[model samples]
Target: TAIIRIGTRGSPLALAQAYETREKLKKKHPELVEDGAIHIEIIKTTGDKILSQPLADIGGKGLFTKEIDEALINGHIDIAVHSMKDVPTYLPEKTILPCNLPREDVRDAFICLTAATLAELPAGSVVGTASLRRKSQILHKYPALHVEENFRGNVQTRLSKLQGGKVQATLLALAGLKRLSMTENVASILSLDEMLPAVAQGAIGIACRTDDDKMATYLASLNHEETRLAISCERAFLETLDGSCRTPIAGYASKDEEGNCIFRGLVASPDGTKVLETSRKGPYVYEDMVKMGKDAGQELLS
Candidate 1:
């Protein structure tokens, strides 16, 4: 048989995820790396080339994964590794996300110059980030703190710029830091209540064509059930709230020991004051979770 080609974006974060996924597969199969059974192929995505405007202005999360998905469907690659947050709530036909790695801290973290935490930052100090969620929350909480968009590249590149004095501070997903073991760069982790995470923030997804049974089966063995359930609810909540990356929305889902689900959904204006949110609970299937989320969003609208 041929080596399984894994498709990913060329950025350090994306390639790192591909390498990590390959390692996980190697650990499970044991013959993978020994036989050159898997190879990583970097594919440049639309998001990688466009840095001049916000993602909301160009397209949604799809900008990052569309090319990779096309490669999968066209048999150019056997599997695709995706940042869970960048995946849309709904996937295309004949494709399935077979696995999700164990989640990391879903909170947003601040890299700052003179502070242990954002709460301790001096008034009027500027904080930089490109995420609408983080920017809005920062303004809502620290009215005096100046928030601005400092858009750039993937995790390592952006952090390098931060270290090189691009700005006084910036915000990044705590999950990415832990995934790459760059936790040292994070100055402080924001609370969930302070900054609700984007849907599926801490998870990593493995995408494959539906007909690829071998790849799907291998991936299934690695799926973290609890993490998948929680992220499923989160994605459902997001799907019902705004689903599109063009909107300012956030979601989180929790599960009890007995497998019950509780989901929270939020949709806010860019300013953060005109916000709507609600919660719902139900059984532990995707449909039930989606229903609960839709009901919550509807309630908020009402």
Candidate 2:
């Protein structure tokens, strides 16, 4: 039997996602498990190797995925599982993301040891986070609080640092907390109104060579059309904005029960000195959704 290898980072969260990809495949195609037809390969990325510096200083979106993407393009792996947010807006030639798993929660969780909630924190509380989006949003609400990058690590490490009083507060994605079963540590869940999430924050994307018909056929079975549609809108908004670490941008899109796509997008200064946001709704079709998202982003840019 031909073996299908999946590439992923070595982080616990990355390993969990790799296992999930394998399990979903095994459940869909039992033959894959019967005869050692599947394998998981750990690939170290630039982001994985650099732990001390901020992502902006070491390059941005490409740091986390460039290595895995290169492997897929060169045929070292049949597929790659990636957190959609970490994926770059532009992909390398000959490789493509064919599908996305259903999204998780898009809300940011507030975690603190002393304060029960962000609002209850002291005037000069130190909030640790690496995301410019989170830092700007936190500062926007509490200008007195200091936002720093002292809490950079995986979920467990950050939690330990919080327990050790490294910072008074921090922010993490609710989706990650739920995946790692660490929601119990969350002090409170911020509303979208309070802090809009990054584009595609809760989505998982599967990448493979564009010409790999066999892998494409197998991966297509795992695609959630609704999630893909929503992500299309969100990513369209991001691509239109040309977002990067230099600017703070946040956007999210979802389909309501009526099949309408509702998109919210924003651009903010790093220090929260300025913010522009727009919300709009349109038909669920991909073209309409993309246009709606693009228009929302353009509105903010204008």
The CA lDDT of each predicted structure is: 0.79, 0.86
Highest TM-score model number? 2
Tens digits of per-residue lDDT for model 1, 50-150: 88766556755588888999999989999899988888778867799978988777889888766888888888776767777767677777777876665
Which lDDT value does model 1 have at 99? 86
lDDT of 1: 0.79
Question: Pairing residues by index, what is the TM-score of model 2?
Answer: 0.96
The number of the candidate with the highest lDDT is 2
Q: Give the Cα error of residue 57 in candidate 2, in Å.
A: 2.8
RMSD (CA, angstroms), candidate 2:
1.5
